[PDB]
Design a protein around this ligand. Structure first.
Ligand SMILES: [Mg+2]
Ligand SMILES: [Mg+2]
Ligand SMILES: [Mg+2]
Ligand SMILES: [Mg+2]
Ligand SMILES: [Mg+2]
Ligand SMILES: [Mg+2]
Ligand SMILES: [Mg+2]
Ligand SMILES: [Mg+2]
Ligand SMILES: [Mg+2]
Ligand SMILES: [Mg+2]
Ligand SMILES: [Mg+2]
Ligand SMILES: [Mg+2]
Lengths: 120, 99, 132, 194, 102, 138, 101
RNA sequence: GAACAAUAGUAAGCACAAUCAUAGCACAUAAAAACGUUAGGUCAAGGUGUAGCUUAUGGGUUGGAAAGAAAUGGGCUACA
């Protein structure tokens, strides 16, 4: 409602005053978000979409749409191990890589059949 | 080297998340390809040169608005004015060679 | 002959500041650094960003306060807030000085996405250290 | 019209409290500092320059807001936030038997707009194997499972996890690694008998 | 039976800063914090005190005017926490053709 | 004489959660000059003694990084200019810390940290045992 | 403007490399392995050759920020050996001082 | 422009020296070394006064920038 904001700005005008101390300056800037949250933590403001270690380390659940005994598993276990040890990529970002691999392998069907090894 | 030690190492790699089956060093490169960020995605690489256009445009706009005073550009303008008054200015595009 | 950051001696009538009168080999011996930050430590990073920000601040402030600046600025970087200390000749009225400082405190903050403090010390004239 | 106002020095009281004028970090304005301090290399026939217009005094960080009186006054108010350390763990000998797990966590602070530091994700786990319920076979299997991560001179197992992006995720992964290493050391498979 | 675990105390992010501020009271011979501490900039009368603050606020508003009029010169963000208070504000509506959304 | 009254208005609550326990807290402050580090160490120990922390202080060895550049602009390699970067370290050791005590100490420590120095904080978090290792059988 | 046309080209090369970073990584993952059959590796080589020239990270040149000098630059400061000296001799860089030992 | 048992010399200042750094002194090293000479090197670190280009001496893409008849400077390997 516009009237709620109209009544809130009147309150804000009365509460707002010129700063008398640097302590008040720092308090106001911290409440606004300019000042760092002390004690400083290098992970403040970043939550990685609320994921945990099992969304990063364990990626074998995304390898179901691949041949289990073929060389595709041997190739993809290395990329999953790399993504698990990669801290610079997110869980959703790794999903893009594995889905791109799924799409590419399922698109290039003639070559995998001509290679002599059965693949799905 | 024994089968017991091989099984122990294979299980240790599985529990630590390393590569389970034996693989060659040349094929191990794909592991490092994903374990670390690529060079083109590094912040020290893709953010090497600051956007000089932003700085130049902001400074010129401030100078025209009347907040920043650029001595170098003022000197350039004074020299250009003096050269044009002397008689050697900037030729118009399309007539320098033909006309 | 070394010529870096070295003002040549005239006949004995030019005024020089304390920073100008000391050669660059006297840095950390007789005079300190004009800027302080953690980027130039051993195990730290992000030094080029701090250097380019510092040089942009120098060039911006030189045009912001033309002719009234006494000496080089002091750029202190302390916990995400950047303090800029300057010595200015009392040539401009305080009405214009407050306008300029209020303009800068917001422009630099919004340009560098960090809080800034600006402090000015008014001097009647440039302080002379050696022969004048 | 030019005006020259005298500084606060003529108005500063001798017994007036200092932290009131310097509550936080300040750029050391000479007008509010009643102490005549000369800084700089003196001339052969001269003296070091006074505090007025001295860039040397402005370059250095001033500790006028951290005088001992101000520190005591601040800590008197901060005494209300802290909790009392239990006396039951005065010596590390009891701390080892009560809390055998040690978690080393790194924190860094640097001046600048950015906060992310790649070394913040590192979490180290230290567990003394003399405080666990491992049997002989379980201990012998676990030593070979961990390999070089466990030393014999000190008998402390160390876990160095850096795979997770977040520090909390790394801590949870270290706890999971400790759990699985303890659990799988008791399982005897068919290839152990050979 | 012997291990004693104390309880934790949870406080606001600025509660400790307010506790720090409570220790220091107002100074007698000191000008208000908003004005510059340099004597040449210290106001002398009430009209001068009002005028200096008005001039500073006018400069702040002029800077904000440039920031709003040229958003593209401040779109690049360097601070990791991504503070929105310092981002330029847009006066143009997003949708013009749709009457309901306009 | 004009002292304001009732200036202390804190908001402190005691949560039912057990407080975090810390074994050893190492603070390594690195800087360029030694006077700043000495003053900072004096301030830190004076603050810690009032709170009763029994702080231990020692100075790790410094590290000097030197490099060499050309002295002239176009062609002069026989003459060089060598630049030096000194890094001095001060180590403060705290023992027998609690979650709130460490927080309140780091509040008064970091807020007054000098601009020319940086700080690395290492915490030895104390835990008894995880829930799945108390007395499990597979 | 920028410092030089060479710098204006280099920033475009860096932008293109950033844009094509993931695709090149995915393609190279198919070339730097021996598990996959060699039939698809040639197709992957053709695909990576079909990519734009300025997409590979080998074309980037670490020039100076201020003067765009192709050589004599320091990676830590991204500045040439001359601009670095000019800034350091004025005391504008913290912790930097003449080496005397 | 000088006679120390003194005969027109006082002299700010820049140099030299001292100090600083190689974490204790001393030594050594490092650093520093003015005013000027070589119209010494650098319009190609960067900007520049003057004189010249503007459907080009400007801006982009691809492909090539060999080779040694021969002489010489500085280094590595040795000729045990
Ligand atoms: Mg150019
Ligand atoms: Mg003389
Ligand atoms: Mg000595
Ligand atoms: Mg000597
Ligand atoms: Mg020498
Ligand atoms: Mg000497
Ligand atoms: Mg010549
Ligand atoms: Mg020549
Ligand atoms: Mg040129
Ligand atoms: Mg030429
Ligand atoms: Mg030859
Ligand atoms: Mg040679």
């Amino acid at each position: 409602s516009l009237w709620d904001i109209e009544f809130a700005k009147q309150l804000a005008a009365v509460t707002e005053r010129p700063f008398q101390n640097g302590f008040e300056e720092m308090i106001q800037w911290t409440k606004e978000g300019k000042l760092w949250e002390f004690p400083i933590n290098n992970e403040a403001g970043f939550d990685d979409d609320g994921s945990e270690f099992h969304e990063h380390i364990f990626l074998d659940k995304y390898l179901q749409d691949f041949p289990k005994q073929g060389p595709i598993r041997h190739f993809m276990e290395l990329v999953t191990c790399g993504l698990s040890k990669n801290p610079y990529l997110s869980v959703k970002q790794k999903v893009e890589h594995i889905e791109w691999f799924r799409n590419y392998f399922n698109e290039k069907r003639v070559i995998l059949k001509e290679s002599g090894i059965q693949l799905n | 080297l024994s089968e017991y030690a091989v099984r122990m190492s294979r299980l240790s790699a599985r529990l630590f998340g390393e590569v389970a089956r034996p693989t060659d060093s040349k094929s191990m490169k794909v592991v490092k390809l994903f374990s670390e960020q690529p060079l083109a995605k590094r912040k020290e690489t893709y953010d090497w040169y600051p956007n000089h256009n932003t700085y130049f445009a902001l400074m010129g706009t401030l100078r025209f608005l009347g907040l920043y005073r650029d001595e170098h550009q003022d000197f350039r303008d004074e020299q250009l004015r003096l050269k044009k008054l002397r008689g050697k200015g900037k030729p118009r595009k399309g007539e320098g060679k033909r006309a | 002959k070394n010529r870096a950051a070295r003002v040549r001696v005239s006949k004995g009538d030019k005024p020089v500041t304390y920073e100008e009168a000391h050669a660059p080999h006297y840095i950390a011996h007789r005079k300190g650094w004009l800027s302080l930050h953690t980027g130039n430590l051993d195990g730290e990073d992000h030094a080029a960003e701090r250097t380019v920000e510092d040089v942009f601040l120098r060039k911006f402030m030189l045009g912001t306060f033309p002719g009234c600046l006494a000496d080089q600025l002091v750029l202190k970087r302390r916990a995400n807030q950047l303090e800029i200390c300057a010595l200015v000749l009392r040539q401009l009225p305080p009405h214009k000085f407050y306008f300029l400082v209020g303009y800068s405190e917001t422009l630099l903050s919004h340009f560098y996405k960090c809080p800034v403090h600006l402090h000015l010390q008014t001097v009647p004239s440039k302080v002379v250290y050696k022969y004048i | 019209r030019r005006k020259a106002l005298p500084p606060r020095t003529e108005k500063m009281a001798v017994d007036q409290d200092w932290p009131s004028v310097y509550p936080v970090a300040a750029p050391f304005k000479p007008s509010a500092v009643p102490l005549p301090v000369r800084m700089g290399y003196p001339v052969k026939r001269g003296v070091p320059m006074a505090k007025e217009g001295n860039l040397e005094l402005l370059k250095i960080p001033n500790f006028l807001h951290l005088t001992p009186v101000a520190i005591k006054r601040h800590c008197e108010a901060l005494k209300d936030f802290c909790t009392e350390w239990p006396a039951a763990l005065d010596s590390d000998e009891k701390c080892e038997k009560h809390f055998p797990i040690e978690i080393d966590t790194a924190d860094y602070v640097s001046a600048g707009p950015s906060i992310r530091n790649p070394k913040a994700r590192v979490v180290t786990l230290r567990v003394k194997l003399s405080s666990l319920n491992l049997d002989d076979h379980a201990k012998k299997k676990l030593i070979k499972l961990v390999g070089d991560r466990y030393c014999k001179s000190t008998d402390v197992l160390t876990i160095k996890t850096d795979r997770c992006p977040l520090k909390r995720q790394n801590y949870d992964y270290a706890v999971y690694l400790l759990t699985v290493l303890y659990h799988e050391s008791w399982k005897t498979e068919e290839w152990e008998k050979k | 039976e012997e291990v004693v675990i104390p309880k934790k105390k949870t406080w606001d992010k600025v509660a400790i800063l307010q506790a720090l501020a409570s220790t220091v009271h107002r100074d007698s011979t000191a000008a208000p914090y908003v004005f510059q501490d340099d004597p040449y900039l210290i106001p002398t009368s009430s009209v001068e005190s009002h005028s200096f603050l008005l001039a500073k606020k006018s400069g702040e508003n002029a800077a904000k005017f440039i920031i709003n009029s040229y958003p593209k010169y401040f779109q690049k963000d360097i601070a990791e926490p991504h503070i929105p208070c310092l981002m330029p504000e847009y006066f143009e509506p997003q949708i013009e053709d749709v009457s309901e959304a306009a | 004489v004009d002292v304001p009254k009732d200036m202390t208005k804190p908001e402190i609550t005691i949560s039912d959660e057990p407080d975090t326990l810390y074994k050893r807290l190492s603070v390594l402050v690195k800087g360029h000059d030694k006077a700043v580090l000495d003053s900072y160490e004096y301030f830190a120990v004076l603050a810690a003694k009032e709170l009763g922390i029994s702080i231990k202080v020692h100075e790790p060895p410094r590290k000097i990084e030197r490099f060499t550049l050309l002295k002239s602009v176009h062609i002069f390699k026989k003459h060089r200019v060598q630049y030096e970067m000194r890094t001095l370290y001060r180590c403060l050791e705290l023992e027998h810390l609690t979650g709130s005590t460490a927080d309140v100490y780091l509040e008064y420590i970091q807020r007054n940290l000098p601009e020319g120095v940086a700080m690395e904080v290492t915490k030895t978090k104390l835990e008894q045992l995880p829930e799945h290792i108390r007395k499990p059988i597979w | 403007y920028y410092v030089d046309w060479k710098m204006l080209r280099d920033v475009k090369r860096r932008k293109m490399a950033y844009e094509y970073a993931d695709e090149r990584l995915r393609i190279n993952s198919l070339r730097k392995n021996t598990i996959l059959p060699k039939d698809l590796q040639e197709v992957a080589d053709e695909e990576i050759a079909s990519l734009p020239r300025d997409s590979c990270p080998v074309r980037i040149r670490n020039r100076c920020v201020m003067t765009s000098r192709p050589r004599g630059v320091k990676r830590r400061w991204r500045l040439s050996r001359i601009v670095f000296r000019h800034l350091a001799d004025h005391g504008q860089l913290s912790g930097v001082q003449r080496a005397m030992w």
